[PDB]
């Protein structure tokens, strides 16, 4: 019998993996932007620690 599950090699799992990696990349980019422009009044406005 064939076994059914979402595999890392199947194209759908590949799509999900690339989307998750893209999301992590964008989150890191946003965090770096805040760390750079930490003293900016707009960045200061929103709670930077939170």
């Amino acid at each position: 019998k064939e076994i059914e599950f979402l595999s890392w090699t199947e194209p759908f799992g590949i799509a999900l993996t690339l989307f998750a990696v893209l999301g992590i990349f964008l989150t890191a980019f946003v965090l770096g932007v805040f760390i750079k422009f930490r003293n900016t009044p707009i960045v200061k406005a929103t709670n930077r620690e939170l």
Binding site: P41, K44, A45, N47, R48
Partner: protein, 50 residues
């Protein structure tokens, strides 16, 4: 403008300007509003949000 440009410290203080007269009570209203703004901004600086 000639009065306000004499404020070399354009970061940690603010000047609120009026023209008075009018033989009315708008002066105390302006003072009240400006004091409320000063209090709010003091709290914002104390929180770091400004």
């Amino acid at each position: 403008c000639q009065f306000e440009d004499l404020n070399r410290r354009k970061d940690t203080k603010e000047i609120y300007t009026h023209f008075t007269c009018s033989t009315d009570t708008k002066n105390v209203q302006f003072v009240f509003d400006a004091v409320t703004d000063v209090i709010i901004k003091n709290n914002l600086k104390e929180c770091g949000l400004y």
